[PDB]
Amino acid sequence: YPVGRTYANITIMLSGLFPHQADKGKQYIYSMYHMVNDPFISNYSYYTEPFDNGFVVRIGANSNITGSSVVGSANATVKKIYPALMLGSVVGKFPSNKTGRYFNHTLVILPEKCGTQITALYCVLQPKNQTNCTGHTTYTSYVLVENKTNLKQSLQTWFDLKDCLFEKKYNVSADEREEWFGITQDQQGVHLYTSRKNGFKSNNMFLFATLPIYERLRYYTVMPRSIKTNDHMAWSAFYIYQLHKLNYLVEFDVEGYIVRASDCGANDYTQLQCSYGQFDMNSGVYSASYFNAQPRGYYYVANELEECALDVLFKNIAPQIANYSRRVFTNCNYNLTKLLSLVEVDEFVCDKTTPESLATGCYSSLVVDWFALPLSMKSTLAIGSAEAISMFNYNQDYSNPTCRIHATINSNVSSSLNFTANNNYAYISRCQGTDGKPILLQKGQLPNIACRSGVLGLSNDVDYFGYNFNGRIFYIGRKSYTPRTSEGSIQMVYVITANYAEGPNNVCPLKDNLDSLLGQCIDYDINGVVGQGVFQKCNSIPSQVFVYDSFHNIIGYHSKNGTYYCMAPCVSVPVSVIYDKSSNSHATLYGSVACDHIKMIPSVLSRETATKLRASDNGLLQTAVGCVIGFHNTSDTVEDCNLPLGQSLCAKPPSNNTFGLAVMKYENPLKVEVLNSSEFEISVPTNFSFRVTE
Amino acid sequence: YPVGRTYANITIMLSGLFPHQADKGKQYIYSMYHMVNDPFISN
Amino acid sequence: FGITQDQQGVHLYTSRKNGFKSNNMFLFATLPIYERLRYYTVMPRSIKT
Amino acid sequence: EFIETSIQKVTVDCKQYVCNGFERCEQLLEQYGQFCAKINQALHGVNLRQDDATKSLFESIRVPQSAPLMASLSGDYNLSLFETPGNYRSALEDLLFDKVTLSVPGYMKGYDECMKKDLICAQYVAGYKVLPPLYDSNMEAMYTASLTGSIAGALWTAASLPFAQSIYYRMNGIGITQNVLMENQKLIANKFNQALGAMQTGFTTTNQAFQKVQDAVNANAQALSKLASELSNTFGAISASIGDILKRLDTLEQEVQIDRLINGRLTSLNAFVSQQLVRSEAAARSSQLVKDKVNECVKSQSSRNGFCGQGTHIVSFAVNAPNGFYFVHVGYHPTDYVNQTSAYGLCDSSNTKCIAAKNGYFIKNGSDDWMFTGSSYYQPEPITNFNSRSVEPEVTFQNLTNNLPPPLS
Amino acid sequence: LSKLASELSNTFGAISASIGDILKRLDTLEQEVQIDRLINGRLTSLNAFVSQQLVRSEAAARSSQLVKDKVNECVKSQSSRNGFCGQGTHIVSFAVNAPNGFYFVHVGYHPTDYVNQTSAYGLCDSSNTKCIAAKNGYFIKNGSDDWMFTGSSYYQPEPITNFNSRSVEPEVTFQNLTNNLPPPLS
Amino acid sequence: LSKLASELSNTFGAISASIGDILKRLDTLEQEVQIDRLINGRLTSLNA
Ligand SMILES: *[C@@H]1O[C@H](CO)[C@@H](O[C@@H]2O[C@H](CO)[C@@H](O[C@@H]3O[C@H](CO)[C@@H](O)[C@H](O)[C@@H]3O)[C@H](O)[C@H]2NC(C)=O)[C@H](O)[C@H]1NC(C)=O
Ligand SMILES: Nc1nc(=O)c2nc(CNc3ccc(C(=O)N[C@@H](CCC(=O)O)C(=O)O)cc3)cnc2[nH]1
Ligand SMILES: *[C@@H]1O[C@H](CO)[C@@H](O[C@@H]2O[C@H](CO)[C@@H](O)[C@H](O)[C@H]2NC(C)=O)[C@H](O)[C@H]1NC(C)=O
Ligand SMILES: *[C@@H]1O[C@H](CO)[C@@H](O[C@@H]2O[C@H](CO)[C@@H](O)[C@H](O)[C@H]2NC(C)=O)[C@H](O)[C@H]1NC(C)=O
Ligand SMILES: *[C@@H]1O[C@H](CO)[C@@H](O[C@@H]2O[C@H](CO)[C@@H](O)[C@H](O)[C@H]2NC(C)=O)[C@H](O)[C@H]1NC(C)=O
Ligand SMILES: *[C@@H]1O[C@H](CO)[C@@H](O)[C@H](O)[C@H]1NC(C)=O
Ligand SMILES: *[C@@H]1O[C@H](CO)[C@@H](O)[C@H](O)[C@H]1NC(C)=O
Ligand SMILES: *[C@@H]1O[C@H](CO)[C@@H](O)[C@H](O)[C@H]1NC(C)=O
Ligand SMILES: *[C@@H]1O[C@H](CO)[C@@H](O)[C@H](O)[C@H]1NC(C)=O
Ligand SMILES: *[C@@H]1O[C@H](CO)[C@@H](O)[C@H](O)[C@H]1NC(C)=O
Numbered sequence A: 001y002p003v004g005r006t007y008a009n010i011t012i013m014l015s016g017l018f019p020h021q022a023d024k025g026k027q028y029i030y031s032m033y034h035m036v037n038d039p040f041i042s043n044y045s046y047y048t049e050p051f052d053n054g055f056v057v058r059i060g061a062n063s064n065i066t067g068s069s070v071v072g073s074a075n076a077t078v079k080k081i082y083p084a085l086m087l088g089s090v091v092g093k094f095p096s097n098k099t100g101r102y103f104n105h106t107l108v109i110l111p112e113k114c115g116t117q118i119t120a121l122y123c124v125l126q127p128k129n130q131t132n133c134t135g136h137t138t139y140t141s142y143v144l145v146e147n148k149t150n151l152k153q154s155l156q157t158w159f160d161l162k163d164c165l166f167e168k169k170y171n172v173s174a175d176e177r178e179e180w181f182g183i184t185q186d187q188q189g190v191h192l193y194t195s196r197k198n199g200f201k202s203n204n205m206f207l208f209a210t211l212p213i214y215e216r217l218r219y220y221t222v223m224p225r226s227i228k229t230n231d232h233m234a235w236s237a238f239y240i241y242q243l244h245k246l247n248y249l250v251e252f253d254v255e256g257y258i259v260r261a262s263d264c265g266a267n268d269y270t271q272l273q274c275s276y277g278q279f280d281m282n283s284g285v286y287s288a289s290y291f292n293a294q295p296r297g298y299y300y301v302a303n304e305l306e307e308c309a310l311d312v313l314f315k316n317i318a319p320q321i322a323n324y325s326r327r328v329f330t331n332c333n334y335n336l337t338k339l340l341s342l343v344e345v346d347e348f349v350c351d352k353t354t355p356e357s358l359a360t361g362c363y364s365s366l367v368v369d370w371f372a373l374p375l376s377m378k379s380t381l382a383i384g385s386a387e388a389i390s391m392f393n394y395n396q397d398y399s400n401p402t403c404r405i406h407a408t409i410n411s412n413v414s415s416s417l418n419f420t421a422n423n424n425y426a427y428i429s430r431c432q433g434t435d436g437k438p439i440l441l442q443k444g445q446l447p448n449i450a451c452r453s454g455v456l457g458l459s460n461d462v463d464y465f466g467y468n469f470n471g472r473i474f475y476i477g478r479k480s481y482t483p484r485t486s487e488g489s490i491q492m493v494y495v496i497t498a499n500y501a502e503g504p505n506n507v508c509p510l511k512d513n514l515d516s517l518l519g520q521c522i523d524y525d526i527n528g529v530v531g532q533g534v535f536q537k538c539n540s541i542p543s544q545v546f547v548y549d550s551f552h553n554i555i556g557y558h559s560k561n562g563t564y565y566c567m568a569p570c571v572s573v574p575v576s577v578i579y580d581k582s583s584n585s586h587a588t589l590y591g592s593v594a595c596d597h598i599k600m601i602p603s604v605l606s607r608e609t610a611t612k613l614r615a616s617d618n619g620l621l622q623t624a625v626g627c628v629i630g631f632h633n634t635s636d637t638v639e640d641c642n643l644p645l646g647q648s649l650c651a652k653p654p655s656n657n658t659f660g661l662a663v664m665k666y667e668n669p670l671k672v673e674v675l676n677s678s679e680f681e682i683s684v685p686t687n688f689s690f691r692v693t694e
Numbered sequence B: 001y002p003v004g005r006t007y008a009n010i011t012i013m014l015s016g017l018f019p020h021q022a023d024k025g026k027q028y029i030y031s032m033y034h035m036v037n038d039p040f041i042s043n
Numbered sequence C: 001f002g003i004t005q006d007q008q009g010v011h012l013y014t015s016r017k018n019g020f021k022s023n024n025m026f027l028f029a030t031l032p033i034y035e036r037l038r039y040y041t042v043m044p045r046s047i048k049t
Numbered sequence D: 001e002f003i004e005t006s007i008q009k010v011t012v013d014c015k016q017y018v019c020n021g022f023e024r025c026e027q028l029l030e031q032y033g034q035f036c037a038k039i040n041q042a043l044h045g046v047n048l049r050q051d052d053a054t055k056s057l058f059e060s061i062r063v064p065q066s067a068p069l070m071a072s073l074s075g076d077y078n079l080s081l082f083e084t085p086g087n088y089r090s091a092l093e094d095l096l097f098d099k100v101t102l103s104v105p106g107y108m109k110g111y112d113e114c115m116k117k118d119l120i121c122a123q124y125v126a127g128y129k130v131l132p133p134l135y136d137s138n139m140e141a142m143y144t145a146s147l148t149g150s151i152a153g154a155l156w157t158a159a160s161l162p163f164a165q166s167i168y169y170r171m172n173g174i175g176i177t178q179n180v181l182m183e184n185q186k187l188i189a190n191k192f193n194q195a196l197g198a199m200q201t202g203f204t205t206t207n208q209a210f211q212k213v214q215d216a217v218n219a220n221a222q223a224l225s226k227l228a229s230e231l232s233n234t235f236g237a238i239s240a241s242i243g244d245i246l247k248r249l250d251t252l253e254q255e256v257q258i259d260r261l262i263n264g265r266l267t268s269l270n271a272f273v274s275q276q277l278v279r280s281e282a283a284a285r286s287s288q289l290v291k292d293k294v295n296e297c298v299k300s301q302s303s304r305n306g307f308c309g310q311g312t313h314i315v316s317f318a319v320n321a322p323n324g325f326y327f328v329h330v331g332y333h334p335t336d337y338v339n340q341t342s343a344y345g346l347c348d349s350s351n352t353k354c355i356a357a358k359n360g361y362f363i364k365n366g367s368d369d370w371m372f373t374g375s376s377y378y379q380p381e382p383i384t385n386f387n388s389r390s391v392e393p394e395v396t397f398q399n400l401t402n403n404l405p406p407p408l409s
Numbered sequence E: 001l002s003k004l005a006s007e008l009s010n011t012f013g014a015i016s017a018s019i020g021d022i023l024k025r026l027d028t029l030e031q032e033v034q035i036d037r038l039i040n041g042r043l044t045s046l047n048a049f050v051s052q053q054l055v056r057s058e059a060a061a062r063s064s065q066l067v068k069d070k071v072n073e074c075v076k077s078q079s080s081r082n083g084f085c086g087q088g089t090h091i092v093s094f095a096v097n098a099p100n101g102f103y104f105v106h107v108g109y110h111p112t113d114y115v116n117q118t119s120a121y122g123l124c125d126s127s128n129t130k131c132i133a134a135k136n137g138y139f140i141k142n143g144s145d146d147w148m149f150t151g152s153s154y155y156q157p158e159p160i161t162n163f164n165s166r167s168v169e170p171e172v173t174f175q176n177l178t179n180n181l182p183p184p185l186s
Numbered sequence F: 001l002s003k004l005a006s007e008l009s010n011t012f013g014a015i016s017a018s019i020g021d022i023l024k025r026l027d028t029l030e031q032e033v034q035i036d037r038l039i040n041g042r043l044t045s046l047n048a
């Protein structure tokens, strides 16, 4: 049941953790003692199954009947037995080369006193170096055994508990009805769900415990349990199903319980139900969506070129802000770790990008602007600033993705790679001309050459100096600053501008197959172009790589080896579901597509159509409107059709269980012939009947 | 040609640096030496 | 032939690219000149007869 | 004159259109409600209503009796434009479907050439699909051919007549007198063929009615292009590709950019659905109009001006069109008029019995000897009991005694 | 109505669909940003409802004119046109109320079995002086001669009588007969 | 006509209904943000 919000008598779409439809799960059986007698077990301590968003256990079921004892050959009444789980984060091997050992802290769930109390202790299980117990060279398995009348005292024999956090005890009333138990881990902890909340009158599960376990459990196993007593009693089998992140369409009843759901990707009819958000449907031809077209792969290629010269940022002297230097990097692969390892970044300001995505991602160029500037005046580089820095020294161009990195270099690293700052540092505090107005600086431009030459010429601070330059006199001003921290470190400012385009995208991150993923929805990352799509091999300019469409949709890819790949969106083939309400049968129309294409994309279809199309062939007919699956050709002609398929084409519902593919026939009127003679033939009735037309 | 994005068989409304229609511009012509010395140029 | 200065440098355009089958111009060079150019002039020359 | 009675039935995959199969976008779309289910139900509703409208229209067009050999067995009336000759379409239907610039999508294997090698080819990338029509192109043409073969039934209270006899009975009830038709049979057929030839040679950019057939196709194409053109718009985001937004930007700002893409796609889909509803209303009105036009003009003769074409109606032919039905109305257009005078009704001086003109006027030939002519053609003739009736005497009736017509003597 | 009512719970990208929760949780600068994106969704819903009501008013006006025509052509009098007033040939129609409109019950004349026959445009003697034509029927024949008259919608051979055959003009395609001529033509 | 003409004075959440005042009062990023919500209102008016 979805925690957080309670619904009642409605029908909505959920996106929680649910098992997929018709999942058989894993079945586990518990045995008795023989007929001294010995435990009987089923190799259950060797499997460390993955957690994978938790699981769900069908505790009980298959009860109240005459079962079979596992030992010998005998029959007895089956009773409900509670499984004991064992959940941990890291696995390993026992010192017998036999798997099933959980290192570090281990959540252990196991019932007490013939299943009337549930104990969930979470701590480390150290093996006990004895004979035939865990931790020796001679070891088969650990068995949790208990008579008829505590399980933890049987756990003390095999394992030795140490440094143990908590032990939660929960009370459960003994019964024989089928019970649902589920486990799920979130940021708050390991939630526990059971069907015994709010009375016990449904199979829905509500949260009853939240154990604090803040590292993720990745594995779980089952204690092999045997109960000391052939034809005495029998124990039920519990089934464990995995939880997947997927969508159901659920329907709540009047007391707000889930009475029916619909796995969206299971059938074609459930794709219809999930696409229209309705359970009870009317007969007709519909339009369904894909609820099983999630990506199942990955592909990444990029051009491999020489390393960009990012080492020029850490040589010569640190530039002044009045005379900063710019470098543009093209047609090379860049490694930004060479920039970010020698500096101590403590401020970044980015737009249209992030520093996490500046390291990856392919651009068309890489413009880097750097100068020395103290951190105390880092607000003068902020957007909208009215200081003298932003109008005469450096105006940032915000039309492109940028990252302004305020970083510092300590004296040890800077002295190692000869980064020095000993000359005077200054900025243009005034750039007026002969006329009394300041010369403002355009976005993304170097300082004005008339003011910059004069400011770099002087060596002392002055506010209204009269410079000459060449011709007209410019009245300039110079103000000094110290970029070096009194500890010894130097403070820098790096502005990195990234230019994206639809072209070749040559500059790519530096790093140290597609034929196996053909026909499936995959995540492709080709030359900085990301998206989703299936890939085929079509016939082939093999230098522009991405052939486009008039709507700028990518329709094909030219590989580097020479082959031409044929991409399409994962949801591209239109699907119509022919549903008949009386027969409760469904059929599928793949409109306007020839029927060779469906056989080579079975992964993106529904979960039942994939298994029908992967096991042998046949069942697919080529009509005038597409390729139908679930039909059969009947060569029957009809005059009216309640499920019109297309171009004068019917669909007779069944009464195997396949729809009949009929055609519409034109009922000819009563043909009369014209006259050459004077006499003209006529058609007169001789019998009538009243008919009504409302 | 608009760099950064290609197009193929489509009428699109562009924007950029283009010359205005029916502009004569400035016409420059080169020559040889005036009549093999004394080269002949304009200003 | 065409020229254009951007924030990434001075671009150079010519119609000889892609086999020289049209009058459209495509970028073939990007000089690393980050000073914004204000003026241009035509240098006179004369070839010998 | 052309009437457009069919909308373009399309189905849009809402989830693929809005979010392109990205789970982050699909997580953000669920806070806008149940948009995709509502849009799917609206498109299915308009498609179901269009199918029902087509079924009802063709059930109204269907005629219980027809003569398939009537259009070929005729006199000098060159009726080969509507003659059924593979393809079951007539000459005019083929001309209409060939002269229009209509790109019919491949219904049987169109995905094999749209990809693996254009609004018929952009539906597989933009996540919509133009549904195939309810009836085949041949089956619609058999309905039209049966209607055309059933035109020449008996106008009075079925019965099969030649085309020449039928247009004779139509023009007799027009007002043209009995004796004019027998004397101008050849001239009438030669005048009919000239008008049909002029309509045949006028299929250019000069007639407005065929331009309406082109504007219907252009309207459908513009609607589909407007639906498909919002996949490239960014709507203020960094790019129109959701994957590029997911790669370039952090978690907090991806919500803002993906939401501003989502709102644009929602607006586009809602505008398309509202346009489909308005076009469905127009199609319903035009379907009722086509029903009335067929049942009145094609199956009878009009007594009302303007309806069934300008002039005065004689015969009408209905053929199929790319988006609706095409009507060819043949009218009676007189050219030269003669001024005359007549009377409400003539009779003798005793006023015992008085008569009135039937389907014409009592013209005067000289100072006396009143004659009768047709109401649409000039042909004086003696007054006969089959072109006049006995009516009540009136105070405005003419009194004559020198020459009495045989009804009066 | 469900579309109008169920879009109050849509957050439209905000943190919540409740104005009070937004006012409590957020500062006065982000409150504007979140309340505005709720407001845009509500305005879109109201404008969509108003436009839909306008289109439905258009449909209601067209259908009201249609119902007026149906009543005055079907219910108060029988109709001479096919297809209208129900399929078949109209005889009588009944109009009753419906939830959102009106319900019409059209009763039609639907023939079942047909008999082929031959008839004539007119019928007169060898003198071709006066000729008659059938009224609401055709002049059928039962053999070599003795032309008779039947109804146009039911087969019943009846003798030709002056109330079911009007006198018309002679025509060149009319039959000539002098053996068993009907009393109108004798 | 009044609905067409009177929705040009609505700010739709922006600081002003005049583009020139927005360009005078805000930096580049907020100019891009605030002009777009005026643009959406004008597009909605024209489409309506
Ligand atoms: C981008 O630049 C960074 C920094 O220059 C590269 O990281 C460097 O990677 C090398 C390769 O592994 C590391 O060398 C290793 O050194 C240890 C001893 O220090 C040695 O035992 C290993 O066998 C190996 O040689 C190096 O330490 C590491 N430097 C830093 C600062 O992380 C990075 O590899 C570059 N990117 C690419 C794609 O090459
Ligand atoms: N010792 C012992 N333990 C058990 O748990 C046990 N369980 C059974 C239960 N046997 C059966 C037999 C048939 C189906 C069966 O037909 N199930 C359907 C699903 C439909 C349904 O029953 O609800 C199936 O899919 O197989 C199930 C359990 C029998 N002997 C036992 N013996
Ligand atoms: C997981 O278990 C390992 C041992 O299997 C722990 O490693 C020990 O840590 C203690 C405390 O720091 C040391 O005194 C031991 O020498 C370590 N032994 C080994 C073999 O590494 C490890 O600390 C545990 N993990 C956590 C998070 O506690
Ligand atoms: C086995 O039998 C017991 C009783 O004979 C079943 O328990 C009942 O289950 C129904 C099902 O809803 C409840 O309404 C009753 O209240 C239960 N009675 C008791 C005393 O608990 C049990 O469900 C049966 N097991 C199976 C698997 O059907
Ligand atoms: C201002 O910066 C520029 C470049 O950042 C300096 O120009 C360089 O000068 C050195 C030696 O003078 C040359 O070797 C380089 O080739 C020059 N590079 C460029 C791009 O011109 C310039 O010297 C600096 N001004 C001052 C006063 O130091
Ligand atoms: C639950 O919904 C059904 C219709 O699905 C309705 O008939 C019934 O009254 C509802 N229950 C309550 C308590 O309102
Ligand atoms: C376990 O494996 C190790 C090496 O893999 C081997 O030396 C040892 O004998 C094995 N022990 C057993 C009980 O198999
Ligand atoms: C167990 O003890 C024996 C001897 O007492 C020793 O040889 C062996 O290594 C021990 N094993 C472990 C896992 O401590
Ligand atoms: C069962 O009882 C016997 C003695 O009654 C005892 O030896 C044995 O350990 C018990 N089994 C357990 C506790 O699992
Ligand atoms: C569980 O049961 C025991 C004994 O019946 C009792 O002491 C304890 O308080 C119970 N705990 C809860 C949570 O009900």
Ligand SMILES: *[C@@H]1O[C@H](CO)[C@@H](O)[C@H](O)[C@H]1NC(C)=O
Residues within 6 Å of the ligand: A410, A412
């Ligand atoms: C620089 O390196 C030297 C030698 O390792 C060390 O003594 C000094 O502390 C380092 N500088 C800083 C700031 O830690």
Ligand SMILES: *[C@@H]1O[C@H](CO)[C@@H](O)[C@H](O)[C@H]1NC(C)=O
Residues within 6 Å of the ligand: A416, A417, A418
């Ligand atoms: C720094 O300069 C000195 C001066 O000679 C030189 O010896 C040394 O190699 C330089 N170091 C680097 C990293 O360039």
Ligand SMILES: *[C@@H]1O[C@H](CO)[C@@H](O)[C@H](O)[C@H]1NC(C)=O
Residues within 6 Å of the ligand: A537, A538, A539, D116
């Ligand atoms: C590619 O061309 C060859 C040459 O005729 C043809 O046989 C093959 O079917 C083509 N493949 C595709 C995918 O078009």
Ligand SMILES: *[C@@H]1O[C@H](CO)[C@@H](O)[C@H](O)[C@H]1NC(C)=O
Residues within 6 Å of the ligand: A621, A622, A623, A633, A634, A635
């Ligand atoms: C069904 O069979 C008939 C006759 O056998 C044939 O004409 C028709 O093409 C077939 N339909 C399909 C889809 O194969």
Ligand SMILES: *[C@@H]1O[C@H](CO)[C@@H](O)[C@H](O)[C@H]1NC(C)=O
Residues within 6 Å of the ligand: A686, A687, A688, E112
């Ligand atoms: C008319 O047809 C109906 C049904 O075929 C039949 O029951 C009835 O007897 C017929 N009447 C005559 C007079 O043939």
Ligand SMILES: *[C@@H]1O[C@H](CO)[C@@H](O)[C@H](O)[C@H]1NC(C)=O
Residues within 6 Å of the ligand: B009
């Ligand atoms: C676009 O391409 C098609 C086929 O390549 C061509 O026939 C057409 O002339 C081109 N231009 C336009 C405007 O459609």
Ligand SMILES: *[C@@H]1O[C@H](CO)[C@@H](O)[C@H](O)[C@H]1NC(C)=O
Residues within 6 Å of the ligand: D078, D080, D197, D200
């Ligand atoms: C009818 O017209 C067509 C072309 O309009 C011509 O080819 C044909 O010969 C004509 N038929 C007669 C009988 O004149």
Ligand SMILES: *[C@@H]1O[C@H](CO)[C@@H](O)[C@H](O)[C@H]1NC(C)=O
Residues within 6 Å of the ligand: D349, D351, D394, D395, D396, D397, D398, D399
């Ligand atoms: C014809 O005579 C009658 C009776 O004498 C008279 O009432 C009527 O006005 C006369 N008509 C004309 C046109 O004079």
Ligand SMILES: *[C@@H]1O[C@H](CO)[C@@H](O)[C@H](O)[C@H]1NC(C)=O
Residues within 6 Å of the ligand: A678, E126, E128, E172, E173, E174, E175, E176
């Ligand atoms: C009847 O007789 C008249 C005059 O003799 C002739 O014109 C007409 O064609 C005849 N009718 C038939 C059907 O022969």
